Design a protein around this ligand. Structure first.
Ligand SMILES: Nc1ncnc2c1ncn2[C@@H]1O[C@H](COP(=O)(O)OP(=O)(O)OP(=O)(O)O)[C@@H](O)[C@H]1O
Ligand SMILES: Nc1ncnc2c1ncn2[C@@H]1O[C@H](COP(=O)(O)OP(=O)(O)OP(=O)(O)O)[C@@H](O)[C@H]1O
Ligand SMILES: [Mg+2]
Ligand SMILES: [Mg+2]
Ligand SMILES: [Mg+2]
Lengths: 595, 595
């Protein structure tokens, strides 16, 4: 109705959303040491802190509990703001304008950054309008996509995390995952002179699209091409995000459309759900068919969600080499690890934009797609699926979704932890130590298999784009050897300490202690024991276990927000070794002393 | 359908659209001396030229007539392109890649430029699907808006002229002036803490909006506010481009919507047509009511079509000063000059984006509006209205619309030229010399009143954004004094030589010569006579006519494409003096030797 598109934008909901983001900015900027909150002694008997603006006129006061890994658990309800003796409302845009110098926001970035904050607050507002499911309801539900679309936090480190800049509000309401709006994919026929299909082992092109689309939808598509005088044999099918088609391909790639390099074939019939990754689609009409990952030229969390055409050629081969490696490794067999492969990929090489740009240009990232197998067919009765991100979910009441899997399970907290850590964490140690293999194993990149509230096994996704072998001489099959990187010995283990300890377990341990379920002490003792249990079981690697010490007293603080604030479009650039990293002192390893 | 949004994008139209844009590229790049065509020996008549790529491997051949002001009338049909012995098809993207260095197209700029070339070509394709009216049929029509929306060329110097980047293809189809789609404006209530209305003489706010919307639409609007707990007294009506609402104001300005600084009221009832200026709307329901000029954060022709809040305070006062000045001057009274005033304006100051940006940022331009009186009430039976751009319109067969006004008038071409030049060109001479006052008097900024094919009088528009008094000490009413600028004496007369002669008459004289209607000699003879006739009628300015000599042998070549090629987003900066200018040698004044 026009008014309906903005109904979620009200003073009360805006207000809650601003208290929520300022709470997280005080928390996470303090963690990253942009803010050093000073204590005031009286009220909470050691619990009240102030942070001042660049000019020192405006003060932010809060109650916080400081947990392992220099984690500030800032109380939302406690946040207040003062200038020259009086109180002001909590306003995120103002907070950023007031601590511009202090956070190293440049004149250049600050405005776009405020636009990403607005958009993050807009989403918070939309989600505060959805039925407010407790973590109990959501865990009891056992609906994979009720959990996928129920998540509210997004990336727990990045403050400006849920931006989706590029979507008008109409497009936010149609495309953001938290809406759970069905999407039909748009299907193009891409001429073989500029498009290329890559198949994983056991994939054949004709049967693959037959399986995905149905014989009848393939023939109809072959009929659009014949009616236009074109030979179906000269084209490959490429599905696209409807936003990419209507806003980019019809304008940016108009030449391709006009010349018949791209023919529009229409919507496919199946209904998709955008996942936490906004450009990845799960097939709601047929949960067993492939996810489709699409090119989407929006700004989110320091990157265009474009998809590289050039990465596609090697992508199924990387997945096949990894699946085979997991199959053949006793330790990985025993954790129950599995991936959902990227089975198939199609790239489109825009020849002219290629002649006009470098290999790093988002103008070469505007038309690819890949298919990735669904985890649904692999589950048995009593099993349900949930993104690992669910484990750091709190509901509207502060109630941990992990806490609710624990209550549902009947296990002690720590028994429950040991099943999860054996399934998710031990594969990561083994992969590091046995093969120098690291993934990007954050909430979004792992799916848990649950049975009566217990983590039975973990499924890694996002394989070709994310995995590395940290050894430049790694002998690999020619097709997968791009994964071989050069990372200095003193940084290798950060793959575990940063991406698991500091960017995930910090939140999990905090949530469980805050809600009174189990001490950080017990939490970290459990991680320690699983670590020792794994190491004891592979004595062949003892020299490497000492070289890369999981029980080192400290490790480097790697600041995630600092990357985004120095560059709101290219967070990490063409550093093909690494070292766009912002390392600022060290944290105390909660494992220090438990070897 | 989906297929229907791109129906205009076919190989035959694409192929035509590229021939037309490469012809224009060769012509105007040559005019601006980026290219230096070399003669091929007189095999097929003489007048055959070659242009080579940066790498000398690609050759562009054409025939061309060279006309006054170094105008290259390149024959579209003659453009051929060759490489290593063999002919290639005409592709504008390739032409730009091949001459990237030659045209000073930087790595940063080239991909965006190509994206604007693509969008311009799509334009041409859409336009070629329309009913192909002869310059006769149009001239005969008498329909103001059939001529407005019937123009195909756009600005005649700029090659990348009809970009509209920001518009998805559905939005192109909705909002582009050449489509003549009815648009309903979206109305916002803006809180008086951040919004200011400004009135000309005779304008009162309440009566104004009552005349524009009708009392019923105001009552309904008032009731939307009351239904939400809000006092209508606390708010001011701002109409916005629906693109700006859905894609910017709901997202970029979300905090203002949420906090109730902006309330959505609905669509207005009346159907508007976008004018050649994409963000300017003519009321088609009520041709008599005000045009509305909108904030539109789209890239077109080297500028966001944003609209400054900051300049609305002075807009109506600048219009009223000028209108009164014209009324007071015997010479401008005899020419019949009038303006359609900017009567009302409303600005919105986003307080936070303002604290985060400088006076120049496009984030201070996303919400403003002004109302400009319609020319329709002022005309008398026999009189029709037509953009001055119509005079340089050719139809699909090369037929000039100026030529058709001439045929239809019964006058000799020169008698016809004299009426036009008295109405349009004399007020610009007298404004320069008497008042140091200049406009931006191109096709878009002038409307002709026509009687029996004759130009009776001209109406200037685009007053507050464009005019200057080139005397820094000029005594002016407090509220219009910003109009006063410092311009070097040796550049003042370029306002005439460049904006009138080199960027408009050059085209008119060439088109009329090309079609066999009248010689360049006679064309410029006529400009000279009218110049002398004006000059002789104001002897008290004789010293100033000697100083700023209209009959000087040369004046500087000012290049318009070279501006957009250096900086594709801010081609003139709002900072530094008339210094963005790219003067490259001089042109022979066709008035030279006719004092
Ligand atoms: N809890 C979360 N943790 C991490 N990322 C999240 C989370 N919720 C949402 N996201 C989004 O998911 C993306 C994570 O980055 P990543 O590179 O893994 O994504 P991708 O490559 O688009 O995904 P995919 O796994 O489908 O290949 C970001 O765009 C981020 O905003
Ligand atoms: N024949 C034409 N001559 C000049 N500009 C044209 C023409 N056709 C379309 N245009 C468009 O109109 C604009 C002209 O520049 P100008 O700054 O005067 O416009 P504006 O301020 O948007 O217009 P207005 O306030 O007069 O409606 C440009 O964006 C240009 O692309
Ligand atoms: Mg991912
Ligand atoms: Mg990725
Ligand atoms: Mg104009």
């Amino acid at each position: 109705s026009l008014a309906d598109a903005v109904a979620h934008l009200t003073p009360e909901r805006w207000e809650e959303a601003n208290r929520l983001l300022v709470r997280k900015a005080l928390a996470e900027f303090t963690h990253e040491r942009l803010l050093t909150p000073e204590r005031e002694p009286d009220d909470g008997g050691g619990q009240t802190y102030v942070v001042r603006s660049d000019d020192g006129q405006t003060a932010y006061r809060f109650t916080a509990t400081v947990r392992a890994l220099d984690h500030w658990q800032v109380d939302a309800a406690s946040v207040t703001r003062h200038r020259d003796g009086a109180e002001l409302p909590l306003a995120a845009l103002d907070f950023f304008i007031e601590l511009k110098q202090t956070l190293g926001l440049s004149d250049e970035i600050l405005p776009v950054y405020l636009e990403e904050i607005s958009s993050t607050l807009s989403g918070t507002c939309y989600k505060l309008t959805k039925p407010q499911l407790s973590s109990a309801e959501l865990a009891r539900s056992g609906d994979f996509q009720a959990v996928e679309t129920g998540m509210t936090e997004g990336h727990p480190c990045f403050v400006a995390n849920n931006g989706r800049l590029g979507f008008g509000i109409h497009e936010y309401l149609s495309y953001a995952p938290e809406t759970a709006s069905p999407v039909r994919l748009v299907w193009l026929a891409a001429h073989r002179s500029r498009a290329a299909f890559t198949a994983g082992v056991g994939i054949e092109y004709e049967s693959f699209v037959r399986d995905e689309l149905g014989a009848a939808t393939v023939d109809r598509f072959h009929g659009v091409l014949r009616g236009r005088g074109l030979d179906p044999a000269d084209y490959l099918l490429i599905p696209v995000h409807p936003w990419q088609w209507w806003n980019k391909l019809t304008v940016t790639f108009a030449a391709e459309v006009a010349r018949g390099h791209l023919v529009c074939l229409g919507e496919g019939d199946d209904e998709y759900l955008a996942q936490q990754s906004i450009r990845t689609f799960f097939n709601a009409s047929h949960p067993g068919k492939h996810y489709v990952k699409t090119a989407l030229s929006v700004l989110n969390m320091g990157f265009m969600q474009g998809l590289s055409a050039a990465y596609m050629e090697a992508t199924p081969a990387i997945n096949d080499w990894l699946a085979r490696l997991i199959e053949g490794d006793p330790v990985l067999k025993e954790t129950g690890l599995s991936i959902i492969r990227e089975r198939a990929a199609v790239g489109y090489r825009h020849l002219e934009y290629e002649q006009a740009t470098d290999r790093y240009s988002p103008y070469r990232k505007m038309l690819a797609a890949l298919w990735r197998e669904s985890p649904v067919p692999s589950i048995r009765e009593g099993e349900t699926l949930a993104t690992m991100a669910s484990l750091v979910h709190q509901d509207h009441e502060g109630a941990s979704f992990a806490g609710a899997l624990i209550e549902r399970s009947g296990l002690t907290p720590t028994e429950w932890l040991r099943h999860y850590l054996r399934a998710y964490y031990v594969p990561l140690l083994h992969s590091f130590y046995a093969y120098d293999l690291v993934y990007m194993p954050h909430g979004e990149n792992v799916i848990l298999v649950l049975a009566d509230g217990v983590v039975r096994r973990a499924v890694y996704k996002d394989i070709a784009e994310e995995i590395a072998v940290m050894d430049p001489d790694a002998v690999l099959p020619p097709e997968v050897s791009r994964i071989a990187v050069d990372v200095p010995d003193d940084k290798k283990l950060l793959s575990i300490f940063t991406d698991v300890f500091d960017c995930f377990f910090r939140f999990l341990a905090a949530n469980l202690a805050e809600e009174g379920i189990v001490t950080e002490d017990a939490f970290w003792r459990t991680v320690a024991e699983v670590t020792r249990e794994y190491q004891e079981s592979v004595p062949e690697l003892a020299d490497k276990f000492e070289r890369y010490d999981m029980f080192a007293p400290e490790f480097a603080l790697s600041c995630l927000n600092r990357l985004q604030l120095r560059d709101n479009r290219q967070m990490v650039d063409l550093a093909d070794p690494s070292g766009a990293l912002q390392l600022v002192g060290t944290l105390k390893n909660p494992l220090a002393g438990r070897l």
